[PDB]
Design a protein around this nucleic acid. Structure first.
Ligand SMILES: OC[C@H]1O[C@@](CO)(O[C@H]2O[C@H](CO)[C@@H](O)[C@H](O)[C@H]2O)[C@@H](O)[C@@H]1O
Length: 580
DNA sequence: GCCTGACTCG
DNA sequence: CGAGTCAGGC
């Protein structure tokens, strides 16, 4: 059954109402330098479909888009705006992003189109996108008539659904979160994505040749030791060589076969020389295949930059995600791997790279919400939390605490943050469940408030059906009452874990809002590039480094006021590698 | 076209 | 506990 709409051949003064539901269709998954297949407006005067060539040539339309005084309602506006920036066009005045409104209501729904968002309010008038454009190889843009109806139907939805969603967000006390946090942050992400991060490709290609060389050296050693050749990247194949051919012990079996995960390979090391080499191989293979090669083919030959997409509405906790490529997971922990970060340089000559990161933010978040006295005091004095923890559970003095002790006390801390599993803590520290429990038991004695919180958060999450972060983000946990022990336990952990991970998310996001404003006031050329959950990265002129040092941490540290101080450590340098 | 297994970062 | 990317197997 048709929907009435005008397939325009020219822009009109009634298409430019000061409030409209706007659709700008980008079908490309990666919207950087990707085409715009159609436009559609819906407002008090009617519904119109515009062809991009027509719309995006006209001053009145292009002016309306950019006009902040004209209000747009959209679904996934960041997509559009970033896409428009690649054509030299500002998209402003967007005052309601439906995708964001759905994500806040229930992160679990996996809302990723207008239909998905729509179904949530018993609106079935619009088809899903996967339905219209197909999937994979046969994926295609249909003929104008089919397309035009669809775009209008989404616009129609967005128009119809705005008020209803905003009503709910209100009821939840999430109206401010959407309007004053998630929506603005979206603008900033759009600037960060479009800005991109400059890559020194020749550096990487050099590293490529080096890594390649060592691989052939290492791999060849394996065939020598293995007594034959085989595909080392094949789990099944390797398993045959190790567990059958060389007769090593089977310490763990994966669901489909044998586990060759590093943790296992470590224990097998003493038995045969080959195990150590496979480990060396994997890290060398990983750096090469993913971080050197995978990185190279996602650089635009024009800008010589990498432009990631930050998925803002995907995570269950309120965190961000990074894709094509994921810049949130570039190796740091191991030095050989870390040097890859050398290929990440400033955009403009005589500029530097700046990094600002929170110190133990998740644990600071815990002290506040949990109201543990021993935790707050520790942080108020700015102690090393892992040593302190270590001191309390072993009943020792700093002098007594040894590196192994700190490593363990740390595990408990990350465990305590990640929900509490003896299985997990034992698996992690390589010990018996009965042990991990004695640790956890002694922990709760050291921090009775942190215990009390874990109890209450599970009980509230049961009584309410969800848990809320510091800003009023939400995660529904229906398996909290499940009769299955395992299923119930996972939700239990999430119950405890989510207000931490999400509140840490909330703060960094708030920081960014404040950070942008400040950068604007000071008229600094310093710009945000990346965010990695607990840290931000900028690039500014060498001349600005001294003011940033005073500004960036303060704004981060002042984002919110907790019962403990926030602590921001910073670093700058020529390359990303040198920001540390 | 998906799933798996291993490994990368917070 | 969150995420994402590659190879191989199917
Ligand atoms: O543009 C990000 C936005 O798009 C969604 C779909 O609504 O995800 C699509 O695009 C992502 C980035 O290109 C892909 O990772 C994903 O596969 C694709 O569905 C949302 O998830 C996201 O908020």
């Amino acid at each position: 059954a048709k929907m009435a709409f005008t397939l325009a051949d020219r822009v009109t003064e009634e298409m430019l109402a000061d409030k409209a539901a706007l659709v700008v269709e980008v079908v490309e998954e990666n919207y950087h330098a990707a085409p715009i297949v159609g436009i559609a407006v819906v407002n008090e005067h009617g519904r119109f479909f515009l062809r991009p060539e027509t719309a995006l040539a006209d001053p009145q339309f292009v002016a309306w888009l950019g006009d902040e005084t004209k209000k747009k309602s959209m679904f996934d506006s960041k997509r559009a705006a970033v896409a428009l920036k690649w054509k030299g066009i500002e998209l402003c005045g967007v005052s309601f992003d439906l995708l964001l409104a759905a994500y806040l209501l229930d992160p679990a729904q996996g809302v990723d189109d207008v239909a998905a968002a729509a179904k949530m309010k018993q609106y079935e008038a619009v088809r899903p996108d996967e339905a219209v454009y197909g999937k994979g190889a046969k994926r295609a843009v249909p003929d104008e008539p089919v397309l035009a109806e669809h775009l209008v139907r989404k616009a129609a939805a967005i128009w119809a659904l705005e008020r209803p969603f905003l009503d709910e967000l209100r009821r939840n006390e999430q109206d401010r979160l959407l309007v004053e946090l998630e929506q603005p942050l979206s603008s900033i992400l759009a600037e960060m994505e479009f800005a991109g991060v400059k890559v020194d490709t020749k550096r990487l290609e050099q590293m490529g040749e080096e890594l390649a060389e060592q691989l052939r050296t290492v791999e060849q050693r394996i065939y020598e030791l293995a007594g034959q050749e085989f595909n080392i990247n094949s789990p099944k194949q390797l398993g045959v060589i190790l567990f059958e051919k060389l007769q090593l012990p089977v310490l763990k079996k994966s669901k489909t076969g044998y586990s060759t995960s590093a943790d296992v390979l470590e224990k097998l090391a003493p038995y045969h020389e080959i195990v150590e080499n496979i480990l060396h191989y994997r890290q060398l293979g990983k750096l090469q295949s993913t971080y050197i090669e995978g990185l190279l083919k996602v650089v635009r030959p024009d800008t010589k930059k990498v432009h990631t997409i930050f998925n803002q509405a995907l995570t269950q906790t309120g965190r961000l995600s990074s894709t094509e490529p994921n810049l949130q997971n570039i190796p740091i922990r191991l030095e050989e791997g870390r040097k890859i970060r050398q290929a990440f340089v400033p955009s403009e000559s005589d500029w530097l790279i700046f990094a600002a990161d929170y110190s133990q933010i998740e644990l600071r978040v815990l002290a506040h919400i949990a109201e543990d006295d021993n935790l707050m005091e520790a942080f108020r004095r700015d102690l090393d939390i892992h040593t302190k923890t270590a001191m309390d559970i072993f009943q020792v003095s700093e002098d007594e605490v040894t590196p192994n002790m700190r490593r363990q006390a740390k595990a408990v801390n990350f465990g305590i943050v990640y929900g509490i599993s003896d299985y997990g803590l034992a698996q992690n520290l390589n010990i018996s469940r009965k042990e991990a429990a004695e640790f956890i038991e002694r922990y709760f004695e050291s921090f009775p408030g942190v215990k009390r919180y874990m109890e209450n958060i599970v009980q509230e999450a049961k009584q309410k059906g969800y848990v809320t972060t510091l800003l009023h983000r939400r995660r529904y946990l229906p398996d909290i009452t499940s009769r299955n022990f395992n299923v119930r336990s996972f939700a239990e952990r999430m119950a405890m874990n989510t207000p931490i991970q999400g509140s840490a998310a909330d703060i960094i996001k708030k920081a960014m809002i404040d950070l942008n404003a400040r950068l604007k006031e000071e008229r600094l050329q310093a710009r945000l590039l990346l965010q990695v959950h607990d840290e931000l990265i900028l690039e500014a002129p060498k001349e600005e480094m001294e003011r940033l040092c005073r500004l960036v941490p303060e704004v981060m540290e002042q984002a919110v006021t907790l019962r403990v101080p926030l602590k921001v450590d910073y670093h700058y340098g020529s390359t990303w590698y040198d920001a540390k």
